[PDB]
């Protein structure tokens with residue numbers, strides 16, 4: 441079996457680590473041109489095989505965890521932040537049971553409740569913005585999305601305990617998602633690691649007293665906490681108070697920097713394209729009514745332009761750039777055999793700008809989906825939340841949360857660039873962030 445084409449590097453251990461780190465997207469696009477869909481190279485003594493394009497990505501998106509393993513690549517980062525016994529610290533079947541439990545609060549019946557929760561939070565938060573100014577929308581959306589996801593997913597006994605202190609602790613635990621946490625051992629006396637371990641212990645404790653409060657409650661609430669508190673594995677094994685907390689902390693942290701970056705990038709795409717922005721505001725009136733009543737789940741699904749703007753934002757600025765698995769069984773793709781031991785990776789970001797499939801690939805064209813597009817015309821060209829089995833379980837909530845916030849924000853304000861500056865992409869963080877994300881705003885009406 442032919443091994444995928446390898447990119448030679450004169451750098452022994454680091455390999456292509458630095459050239460990749462500077463512009464990973466340009467690195468992979470150039471490799472696609474010179475080497476094709478499947479190629480391999482080493483970074484930090486690890487050998488990576490990338491699957492570019494829809495046909496190649498199919499291998500990972502259709503794979504089973506026995507063949508292409510997730511825990512191998514993601515636990516050393518994850519376990520320190522979310523805690524033991526949860527997510528990638530447990531066998532995949534046990535994780536699948538945890539995932540299904542979480543689904544009990546990730547459905548339409550609950551999303552109808554979430555819409556008015558998120559709208560009200562968006563309004564109350566942006567009270568502090570006044571009538572106009574120049575503020576960092578990324579910092580703002582981070583703070584709002586913490587309060588909104590804690591309210592809808594964690595409950596009101598945790599949301600009432602949410603202050604600036606606890607918001608810092610969540611950012612301290614988010615510091616555990618570093619390249620240093622991935623490569624260097626976790627016990628090392630490094631600053632980010634101590635803040636994670638310290639916050640973890642403190643956040644768990646806030647969650648422990650909220651769990652007890654509910655356990656001794658007269659009435660029951662239909663929400664995710666209630667399920668996790670009253671649920672058992674098939675074995676009949678109950679969840680620990682530690683497991684419940686970790687699953688909740690992990691649920692919120694998975695959709696924070698993912699939703700906060702996307703939400704912010706869309707503002708800039710809409711601030712740059714002023715006519716496209718007003719048309720979205722016009723849709724608020726046409727779909728919901730001239731009185732602009734409180735948003736409903738049903739209304740959100742009729743905001744088609746806004747959906748395409750969210751879709752186009754996710755195409756050009758997806759938060760998760762690489763999806764990674766470890767080869768335990770030899771896999772076959774494009775006539776090559778990937779050897780057990782290679783880390784097989786797919787980049788949604790690259791597949792969603794591949795000149796071979798995307799017309800005007802670098803243009804924010806939300807009407808690209810009203811005509812022939814790779815998102816409908818290929819299986820794995822548009823894969824921002826993943827695909828096949830390896831899909832995001834929070835995708836539907838991400839859409840409700842982002843549509844509700846931005847519907848609410850569009851009603852509240854009109855947005856513009858400051859001297860026509862569009863934020864460059866900060867490639868140095870795992871979730872690519874916008875540089876200098878200060879936006880100009882004024883009151884719409």
Ligand code: HEM
Nearest residue numbers: 691694695698699702760763764824825826830832834838
């Ligand atoms: C724009 C928003 C979001 C995007 C693009 C996104 C993207 C992704 C992707 C690509 C994965 C797959 C990772 C892998 O299998 O290697 C994933 C998994 C996951 N996401 Fe999201 N996500 C978003 C928002 C959220 C939200 C709002 C939540 C929860 C409320 C969430 C929770 C999760 C969880 C729990 C997983 C489980 C990983 C697994 O099953 O292996 N995400 N997400």
